Amino acid sequence: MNLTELKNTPVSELITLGENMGLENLARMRKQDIIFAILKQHAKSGEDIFGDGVLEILQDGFGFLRSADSSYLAGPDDIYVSPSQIRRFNLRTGDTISGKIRPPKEGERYFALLKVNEVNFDKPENARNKILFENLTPLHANSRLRMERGNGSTEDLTARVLDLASPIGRGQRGLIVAPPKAGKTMLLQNIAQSIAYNHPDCVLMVLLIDERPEEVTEMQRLVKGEVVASTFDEPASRHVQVAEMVIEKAKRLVEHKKDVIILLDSITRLARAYNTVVPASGKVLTGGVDANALHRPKRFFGAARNVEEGGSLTIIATALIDTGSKMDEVIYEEFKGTGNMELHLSRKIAEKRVFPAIDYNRSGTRKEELLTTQEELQKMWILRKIIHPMGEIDAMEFLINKLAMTKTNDDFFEMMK
């Protein structure tokens, strides 16, 4: 009936369901076509459907409702919405519109939304009584979000490392600078699992850009919340499509006073995709980029801000370096000064199987006093000072050793003293 209640179910289950509903065996069409035909048959039975979809507007004027499992892409399960609702409520991009729908007749392609029922888990009056994203006051990260899991595990290491190096807060803009083969994807998994198991009160939403399909499957069923991915089976156009989908969805959810955390990896890949989709302007700068080809990525990394009136938008994005090329280096230059949170993963310690390989030297936090209290900052500062004796390798040794003997932050602090 609903979309996700059929999409979180496997393809064989949907085939069996469609065959149970008395239909042409749907194991020949794709899963999206399977659900489309199942909905068409259910609507033929003599009833309406109750659908849900995130909203997209093109230069035409009407609205498209993309689904979750489709990674916010174009498909037959996308619901059509007449522009009349957009003229009524001014529904911008990023509404999980939930409402009643009817089957399409000949000459049509998608289901038509009759009436609105749910606007981003809120009353449709919020569609007419709310505040836009460009008008509020962006602030610094006020709330402190603990990263350590609390079981003393071997991957807890990574979390507690960050906790004693640079914590994460609501409304932060985190950029990870790491060469290839530094343990990026398991870091994403570790930090996401910790933030979702320790703090289920905050909402997670992970973005994957240019990964392997097995990586997509390992990400999608492992972390909580929506797992949006955009792999190589789609061109840079669909890359920017899903990117703009998720950014406007996060913007609207933040407007709805919600805490939205966006993991992103990596930024250089989406920058290349954008360079691919934007035409030239007659001139080519260093690395092979354009003039406006940086405006999209800039905006995309800077949409992060802390909303002091309600909700927040935090982003944790990784970057690619040591690729041999120039464009990645200039992109890192442009994005290393725009973020309000910078962290670095070393490769020399990574290739020695000593993980995690944090750069305790280049790690930093913008205005950390709003993220760390009195004696909390005392402890963090004195430990930074005692680690300050010039060290990368045996500094990682000291950190990992004193972190493996201990379970929590206070244990480490009160055993080192």
């Binding site: 194991a27 020949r28 069409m29 794709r30 399909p213």
Partner: protein, 495 residues
């Protein structure tokens, strides 16, 4: 010029698929097809652009062969004294100096050549993988079904084809299902499809067991061999090293479980698991199961095995299409014969004691001596021709007149074999109508019949070239004789 070529070779994307060597080989081919248009003379021009060192240098391949057409590439086997070619083959030259360089149509030709070669290099890499990774069953979803083949994908642009003989005769195929098969062939420089998967080849079943039976894979049940009729019947003979292992109850599972599972995975194919034996006779005995045999006559020289099943189970012994035998004939690779039904179906006691018609006059000094001897066999008649005296002393009655009669009969046999050889060598038969023709004596008639004709009517239907290579005549007497023949056969109007 050459700097532009260097820029475009350093600017190619698929440097792993198209390294510098293959890129300049592409440029060789492009300059060849360009010179094909530069001059009306369709010539081959290798140019060895020396990508690392410098620029192109148009060469003129001598293309050593006796013909003359397109003489820019024509040299015989020894015209090599000049310039120090000195070679019968491989010696090449550079006659063309300052050829046409890079017109726009040739740039477009090089462009299309380089893009089709990027495609061909992707094909070459995926087929190197096709050739190395000749291993375990692979899953794939099909895209298109045809009468002769179907096309499959795995992901990451992994195209494959399953041919008609690789499928089953009744396995329904439609675009969208996940079917599993085994990669079987290698085709490095093919033009159509790259990977080749089958579901009907014999060894497929082997690997099936290798991934199903937990015993095989650690080499405790060494699978010996197998034969298969596609989708119909898979026979497989296996051999075990351990003594406490029961492959009759282990390879099949619990009351037909493992064999049944792999049969359902095959798509409805009966399977016969048999125990391999080191004796080919016992192997062909047990391979035709379910069937019982009590007549085993194995001959090694002519690769035959008279394996006769008892009368009554024939309709089940041979089965449809002779499968239970054919697979057996494919399990060991031998030949089987069964024709007898009731008249002495033993096929070993019959032929040993059924000679009352051929042994009527052998000891014809006086029939009242003794019967024939089956201890030696008396059943080959030719290996019998020369036997030593180490066994020619047991039977009684071998007096001197007996061996004298033996010598006389040996002379008679030599005379009859000489007559038979003379009859089989003279496949000419010069009749009177061939010798009576004037100017054609006995040897001339022999040769005329050796030409291929033994009559008079067809003789008048040959030309002077059909009588060429004549021994004893020459083309003018040839024409005279053929005119006389066409007069006595056609122009005479006689019968």
């Amino acid at each position: 010029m050459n700097k532009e070529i260097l820029a475009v070779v350093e600017a190619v994307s698929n440097e792993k698929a198209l390294p510098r060597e293959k890129i300049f080989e592409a440029l060789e081919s492009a300059l060849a097809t360009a010179t094909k248009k530069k001059y009306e003379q369709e010539i081959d021009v290798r140019v060895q652009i020396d990508r690392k060192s410098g620029d192109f240098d148009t060469f003129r391949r001598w293309l050593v062969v006796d013909e003359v057409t397109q003489p820019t590439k024509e040299i015989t086997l020894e015209a090599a004294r000049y310039e120090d070619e000195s070679l019968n083959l491989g010696d090449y030259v550079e006659d063309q100096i300052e050829s046409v360089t890079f017109d726009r149509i040739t740039t477009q030709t090089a462009k299309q050549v380089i893009v089709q070669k990027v495609r061909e290099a992707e094909r070459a890499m995926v087929v190197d993988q096709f050739r190395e990774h000749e291993g375990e069953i692979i899953t794939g979803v099909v895209k298109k079904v045809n009468r002769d083949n179907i096309s499959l994908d795995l992901g990451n642009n992994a195209e494959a084809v399953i041919l008609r003989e690789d499928m089953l005769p009744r396995e329904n195929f439609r675009p969208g299902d996940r079917v599993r098969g085994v990669l079987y062939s290698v085709r490095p420089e093919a033009r159509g499809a790259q990977l080749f998967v089958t579901r009907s080849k014999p060894e497929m079943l082997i690997e099936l067991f290798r991934i199903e039976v937990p015993e095989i894979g650690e080499e405790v049940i060494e699978i010996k061999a197998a034969a298969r009729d596609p989708g119909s019947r898979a026979k497989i003979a296996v051999k075990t090293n351990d003594k406490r292992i029961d492959p009759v109850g282990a390879c099949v599972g619990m009351r037909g479980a493992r064999v049944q599972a792999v049969s359902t995975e095959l798509g409805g194919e009966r399977i016969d698991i048999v125990l391999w034996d080191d004796n080919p006779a016992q192997f062909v005995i047990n391979a035709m199961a379910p069937a019982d045999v009590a007549s085993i006559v194995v001959d090694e020289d002519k690769h035959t095995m008279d394996i006769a099943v008892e009368a009554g189970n024939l309709a089940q012994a041979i089965g449809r299409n002779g499968q239970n035998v054919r697979l057996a004939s494919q399990l060991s690779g031998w030949e089987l014969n069964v024709m007898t039904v009731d008249d002495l179906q033993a096929k070993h006691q019959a032929e040993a004691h059924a000679a009352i018609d051929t042994f009527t006059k052998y000891l014809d000094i006086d029939e009242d001596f003794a019967t024939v001897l089956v201890e030696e066999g008396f059943s080959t008649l030719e290996e019998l021709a020369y036997v030593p005296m180490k066994e020619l002393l047991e039977i009684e009655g071998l007096d001197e007149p007996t061996v004298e009669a033996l010598r006389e009969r040996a002379k008679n046999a030599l005379a009859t074999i000489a007559q038979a050889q003379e009859e089989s060598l003279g496949d000419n038969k010069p009749a009177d109508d061939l010798l009576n023709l004037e100017g054609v004596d006995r040897d001339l008639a022999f040769k005329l019949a050796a030409r291929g004709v033994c009559t008079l009517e067809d003789l008048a239907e040959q030309g002077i070239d059909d009588l060429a290579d004549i021994e004893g005549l020459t083309d003018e007497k040839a024409g005279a004789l053929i005119m006389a023949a066409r007069n006595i056969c056609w122009f005479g109007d006689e019968a």
